[PDB]
Design an enzyme around this catalytic site. Structure first.
Site, PDB file in Angstrom:
ATOM      1  N   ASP A 299      34.998 -14.031 -20.497  1.00 35.12           N
ATOM      2  CA  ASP A 299      34.249 -13.419 -21.631  1.00 35.12           C
ATOM      3  C   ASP A 299      35.168 -12.473 -22.413  1.00 35.12           C
ATOM      4  O   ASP A 299      34.653 -11.542 -23.042  1.00 35.12           O
ATOM      5  CB  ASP A 299      32.953 -12.750 -21.157  1.00 35.12           C
ATOM      6  CG  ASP A 299      31.831 -13.738 -20.867  1.00 35.12           C
ATOM      7  OD1 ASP A 299      32.101 -14.945 -20.874  1.00 35.12           O
ATOM      8  OD2 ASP A 299      30.696 -13.286 -20.626  1.00 35.12           O
TER       9      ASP A 299
ATOM     10  N   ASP B 256      34.034  -5.327 -22.294  1.00 38.89           N
ATOM     11  CA  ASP B 256      33.040  -5.258 -21.182  1.00 38.89           C
ATOM     12  C   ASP B 256      33.698  -5.702 -19.883  1.00 38.89           C
ATOM     13  O   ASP B 256      33.161  -6.575 -19.169  1.00 38.89           O
ATOM     14  CB  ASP B 256      31.763  -6.061 -21.416  1.00 38.89           C
ATOM     15  CG  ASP B 256      30.688  -5.718 -20.388  1.00 38.89           C
ATOM     16  OD1 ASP B 256      30.764  -4.629 -19.780  1.00 38.89           O
ATOM     17  OD2 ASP B 256      29.806  -6.555 -20.162  1.00 38.89           O
TER      18      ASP B 256
ATOM     19  N   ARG C 172      31.347  -8.287 -12.901  1.00 37.98           N
ATOM     20  CA  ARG C 172      30.443  -9.378 -13.383  1.00 37.98           C
ATOM     21  C   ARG C 172      31.207 -10.316 -14.321  1.00 37.98           C
ATOM     22  O   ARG C 172      30.824 -11.509 -14.371  1.00 37.98           O
ATOM     23  CB  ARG C 172      29.188  -8.835 -14.079  1.00 37.98           C
ATOM     24  CG  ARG C 172      29.427  -8.100 -15.389  1.00 37.98           C
ATOM     25  CD  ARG C 172      28.146  -7.640 -16.086  1.00 37.98           C
ATOM     26  NE  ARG C 172      28.481  -6.579 -17.027  1.00 37.98           N
ATOM     27  CZ  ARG C 172      28.513  -5.286 -16.720  1.00 37.98           C
ATOM     28  NH1 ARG C 172      28.154  -4.876 -15.516  1.00 37.98           N
ATOM     29  NH2 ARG C 172      28.900  -4.403 -17.614  1.00 37.98           N
ATOM     30  N   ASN C 173      32.254  -9.825 -15.013  1.00 38.39           N
ATOM     31  CA  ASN C 173      33.067 -10.636 -15.959  1.00 38.39           C
ATOM     32  C   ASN C 173      34.410 -11.032 -15.366  1.00 38.39           C
ATOM     33  O   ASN C 173      35.307 -11.350 -16.169  1.00 38.39           O
ATOM     34  CB  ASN C 173      33.227  -9.927 -17.305  1.00 38.39           C
ATOM     35  CG  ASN C 173      31.904  -9.901 -18.023  1.00 38.39           C
ATOM     36  OD1 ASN C 173      31.161 -10.872 -17.908  1.00 38.39           O
ATOM     37  ND2 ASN C 173      31.580  -8.798 -18.680  1.00 38.39           N
TER      38      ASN C 173
END
Ligand SMILES: Oc1ccc(-c2ccc3c(-c4ccc(N5CC[NH2+]CC5)cc4)n[nH]c3c2)cc1
Length: 288
Positions: free
Chosen positions: A164, A146, A150-151
């Protein structure tokens, strides 16, 4: 209790827990063996009240993967753990400027009165730092699954850190219709082979990295705004590719298109992307 690991164990009384970021900001005293009087701001991952033995297994798994992968400038590094005689605390690097989506949106030109702005060089430097983190993770046989702005977290000193990367995901239990905190659909970052055939490789992470380049050059733009999951499937089957952002060179757009190759074997590797971004950074103006 859990098995102790004196590589990583920090005494509970050395960790001053603070506000929520389940992740909380904390101050670690004497995090470094050779510096017991220094406080370090850190992020502490822990279980919520409602957490099952699955939830606890998942948190241990993430921590173990981080020990296994080792340290890099451009990833969120493990700093320690509180595992004995109390709830599990996984202590990781703190990124004071939040996720890259937020960091980019906050520095958009007025439209919104931001205190800081990014040059063209700063944007390419962001892309280079993420590529270098991903090159390191791929070298340790880690598939993110992913990769998205955002990560990526941004430190006080504007260092990009992949977060993450250690997360346990049951990929046969994904809800394609579940949106993020911010109301976007994670399927919009997934390579077609990951999405349709549930095949995740370093090549499907390069596809995601192409979407992340697009987020960078749109200063935190939302991919396929207003497109639901069923329409996204039709777009990908038809070989749709997102438009070139304004204030994006032809060279960086071709890099995004190369990341989005329909044939996984024909995508560039992160090793390739690091070399190309290294060259482009040096040739990109910081004057606007
Ligand atoms: O498995 C995980 C491991 C680490 C993290 C994690 C999450 C957030 C942070 C942060 C962080 C730092 C600042 C913020 N801000 C609040 C919102 N924007 C301004 C800054 C938010 C999160 N630093 N380090 C982190 C590690 C999450 C899951």
């Amino acid at each position: 209790e859990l098995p102790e690991d004196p590589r990583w164990e920090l005494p509970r009384d050395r960790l001053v827990l603070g506000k929520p970021l389940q992740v909380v900001l904390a101050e670690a005293i004497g995090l470094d063996k050779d510096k017991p009087n220094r406080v370090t701001k850190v992020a502490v991952k822990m279980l919520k009240s409602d957490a099952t033995e699955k939830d606890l297994s998942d948190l241990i798994s993430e921590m173990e993967m981080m020990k296994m992968i080792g340290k890099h400038k451009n990833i969120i590094n493990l700093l320690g753990a509180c595992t004995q005689d109390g709830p599990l605390y996984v202590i990781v690097e703190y990124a004071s400027k939040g996720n890259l989506r937020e960091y980019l949106q906050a520095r958009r030109p007025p439209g919104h009165n931001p205190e800081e702005q990014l040059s063209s060089k700063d944007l390419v430097s962001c892309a280079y730092q993420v590529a270098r983190g991903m090159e390191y993770l791929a070298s340790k046989k880690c598939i993110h699954r992913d990769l998205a702005a955002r990560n990526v977290l941004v430190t006080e000193d504007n260092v990009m850190k992949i977060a993450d990367f250690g997360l346990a995901r049951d990929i046969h239990h994904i809800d394609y219709y579940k949106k993020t905190t911010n109301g976007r659909l994670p399927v919009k970052w997934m390579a077609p082979e990951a999405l349709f055939d549930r095949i995740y490789t370093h090549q499907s992470d390069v596809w995601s990295f192409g979407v992340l380049l697009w987020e960078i050059f749109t200063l935190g733009g939302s991919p396929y705004p207003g497109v639901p999951v069923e329409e996204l499937f039709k777009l990908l089957k038809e070989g749709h590719r997102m438009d070139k952002p304004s204030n994006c060179t032809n060279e960086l757009y071709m890099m995004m298109r190369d990341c989005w190759h329909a044939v996984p074997s024909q995508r560039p590797t992160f090793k390739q992307l690091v070399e190309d971004l290294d060259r482009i950074v040096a040739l990109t103006s910081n004057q606007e």
